Amino acid sequence: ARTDNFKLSSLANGLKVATSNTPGHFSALGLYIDAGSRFEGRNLKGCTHILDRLAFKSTEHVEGRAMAETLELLGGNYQCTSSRENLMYQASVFNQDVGKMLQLMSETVRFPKITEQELQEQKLSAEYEIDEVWMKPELVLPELLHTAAYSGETLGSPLICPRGLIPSISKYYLLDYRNKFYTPENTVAAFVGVPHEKALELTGKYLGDWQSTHPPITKKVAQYTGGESCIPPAPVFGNLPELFHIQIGFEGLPIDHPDIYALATLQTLLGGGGSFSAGGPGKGMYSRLYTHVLNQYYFVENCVAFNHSYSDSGIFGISLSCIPQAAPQAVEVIAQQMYNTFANKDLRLTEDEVSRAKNQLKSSLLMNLESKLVELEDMGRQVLMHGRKIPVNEMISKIEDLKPDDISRVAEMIFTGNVNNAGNGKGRATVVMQGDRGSFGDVENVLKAYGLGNSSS
């Protein structure tokens, strides 16, 4: 807003244009589209990923080879990625190259050709990618977590495309998706280190005459349901140890919710990680999950707090990996930690805990923001979501003013299943795990035994 040197305006076609910071050694820019796996429904499953893998191929006014070569000559520092709520084209380039990069981006965003050959390539390649993804627990568990938390809808619609659905992703469906989401009114052009005036010139020049297709509005609010699921134990390799995994969460908060900073502090206060944790002081070894779990139980090789926060909902909870032998204890170990954040009169959150968590949160946010690309992405998404960029000062203040009771209040709200988001979610826990199901015991009974969750509407 102010020290940011943040400026925002719109083109006649609704395209928002956001700039921030001052001149520097180089610049960053990107096009942000309010699209993602949560909007695919069942009909466009996997379209978001294929379009992003199709980014920067041939366009109406630029041959494929030329596109590739010009992007190399620009430094090659660009990318298109997408997730559940985002689809973005970003790059950092030298100052004199902003216009050329914006042109290439707008070409692939407005006039992609999507030839049979380019599509067939990305599809063939997507199958291999999916096969590999399913072997990585750090990617699979969170996928199972979301799917079960929303019963396979919106935020729980598969982020990893079902392998068998890839071959039926046709140009027709890709065009249908583009005609629904690639519209100026659903897009943001952001720039770091580029004067607002220049940005408006370049934007109007390349995106100004872009027109909406006025598609049917298809954006459903996320409805948290909670749920359970378990997949078979992973294959046992060589010297690598066998581990079971479990993730337990409850509906969290929207990224702009008033208690979001409190919640992020809770997450930092719990912290956690892998029993190895490489790095010098400051890594967060005095977080509760390290202290009360990692240091106490080593049949536990990993324990960490997660906080997935989206536009209209979120999932907050704890992740735990352990030896098959300890599986029977997982649920309770996790339940105890959640309980100890608010319902244990003798393990209340201390001034020291909260003060440290607070500072570490301020720290990681501000330090991550040292990168232009990060300032860029954060700005683009914020504007895409509520058309405004929260100033740093405000963010810091809201965190510095947090007090233990704030953190305790939020902990209770979350673990009690008492969050009331627009989707009006159930207070049921989400429990997802990999290993022999039996090995985890009566999961719901242990959670109830601890007063976690909510059973009556």
Binding site: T3, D4, N5, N21, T22, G24, H25, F26, R65, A68, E69, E72, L73, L74, G75, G76, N77, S92, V93, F94, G279, G280, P281, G282, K283, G284, M285, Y286, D352, S355, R356, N359, Q360, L361, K362, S363, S364, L366, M367, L369, E370, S371, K372, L373, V392, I396
Partner: protein, 439 residues
């Protein structure tokens, strides 16, 4: 606008770059030291110190340093290279001074408790066994050993197991006493940093550091230039699935006038991976040959390593121990170097290389941490910091001719050293390589 510099009475240099609109920063103390300051019996000490620096000082016990950094959200880290010893911190701007304090405390007032010194011996050994599983690291450590035969640069950073077991608290304090001089160190900062205040704090917390009795400016010749020794070391290991080869020739030092030209030439040859390709829209003739008729190898990687007074430039190759005749891929690499020497390279590939280099050197200077890294290393090994704009200029002016010249000087009638690990039976000789290369 740019990098501010100040020198302290004891010789310590303070280099800084303010980053507008930031509330955090990075401060690091860089010391001209590392493993190259050790001797055969000394070898491994600098790294040992690195580990003990977090174990306790005359002012803060171990858990006191940890808890203090974590309560304010800072981060403490360190590393040892063949050339330097570096400790650095990341923290909110409010904590810069506390940062400088701790850094000085850790570097100069470390307890070096005898109990700690013994418990650590095992940790270093474990670390050593882990590197033994990183074949690229093994090959390059051996390459340094034969190329810089019986010289400082030829020793590894961890040191021999023998030494890891015999290093004494005396060795440690001796290394500290001998090397930690103000004229041999740089306090670098970037982000929300006031150059003036940081100089004061430097004086306050680092002023007590001894001056050398024979001060030399940071970028001046340590002494006799390292000498590149031609040689070869075949390390037969038939159990390995992949074979690893590094071929090098004398390279360029940090301050060499042709430094960027050397990097440009490295980028022109580039890299390749049997599965991924080149990371380029259009592959060089080498990459094409490598991928043809079944593949000649699993991957190759051009490299250029620099030191204040020397450098190594070459190719790292990984082949399938059972499927590849190493000789065939080496032939192609030499052919590619000869293509450059013969001038048969397009304006396009030169421009592509310069663009890649500029990006790699400049777009990567993003956070305060990467910037401090560049400030510190440049000043501590060179005596100055070329600015991003100066670097851009140095690369932008490179010509096809500069490159052809550089290859003809460095890759014609010059000595080469080589190291190979794995199925050594198919690996060609060093004189074989020179013959084909100079041919």
């Amino acid at each position: 606008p740019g990098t501010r510099t100040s020198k302290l009475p004891n010789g310590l240099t303070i280099a800084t770059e303010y980053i507008p609109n930031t509330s955090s920063a990075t401060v690091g103390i860089f010391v001209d030291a590392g493993s190259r300051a050790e001797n055969v019996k000394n070898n491994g000490t600098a790294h040992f110190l690195e580990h003990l620096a977090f174990k306790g000082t005359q002012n803060r016990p171990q858990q006191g340093i940890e808890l203090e950094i974590e309560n304010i959200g800072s981060h403490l880290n360190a590393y040892t290279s063949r050339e330097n010893t570096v400790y650095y911190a990341k923290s909110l701007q409010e904590d810069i001074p506390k940062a400088v304090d701790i850094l000085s405390d850790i570097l100069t007032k470390s307890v070096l408790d005898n109990s700690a010194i013994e418990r650590e011996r095992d940790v270093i050994i474990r670390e050593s066994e882990e590197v033994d599983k990183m074949y690229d690291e093994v090959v390059f450590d051996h390459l340094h050993e034969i190329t810089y035969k019986d010289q400082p640069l030829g020793r590894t950073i961890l040191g021999p197991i023998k030494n890891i077991k015999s290093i004494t608290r005396t060795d440690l304090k001796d290394y500290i006493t001998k090397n930690y001089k103000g004229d041999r160190m740089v306090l670098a900062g970037a982000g929300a940093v006031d150059h003036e205040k940081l100089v004061q704090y430097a004086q306050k917390y680092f002023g007590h550091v001894p001056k050398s009795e024979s001060p030399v400016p940071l970028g001046s010749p340590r002494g006799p230039l390292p000498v590149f020794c031609r040689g070869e070391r075949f390390i037969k290991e038939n159990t390995l699935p992949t074979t690893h080869i590094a071929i090098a020739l004398e390279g360029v030092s940090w301050s060499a006038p042709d430094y960027f030209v050397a990097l440009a030439t490295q980028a022109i040859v580039g890299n390749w991976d049997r599965a991924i390709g080149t990371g380029t829209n259009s592959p060089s003739p080498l990459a094409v040959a490598a991928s043809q008729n079944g593949s000649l190898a699993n991957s190759y990687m051009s490299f250029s390593t620099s030191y204040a007074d020397s450098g190594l430039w070459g190719m790292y190759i990984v082949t399938d121990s059972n499927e590849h005749n190493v000789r065939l891929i080496v032939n192609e690499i030499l052919k590619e170097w000869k293509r450059i020497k013969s001038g048969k390279i397009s304006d396009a590939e030169v421009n592509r290389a310069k663009a890649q280099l500029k990006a790699a050197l400049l777009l990567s200077l993003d956070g305060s941490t990467a910037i401090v890294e560049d400030i510190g290393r440049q000043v501590v090994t060179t005596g100055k910091r070329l600015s991003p704009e100066e670097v851009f200029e140095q690369v932008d002016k490179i010509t096809k001719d500069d490159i052809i010249m550089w290859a003809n000087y460095r890759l014609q009638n010059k000595p080469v050293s080589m190291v190979a690990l794995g199925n050594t039976s198919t690996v060609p000789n060093v004189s074989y390589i020179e013959e084909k290369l100079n041919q």
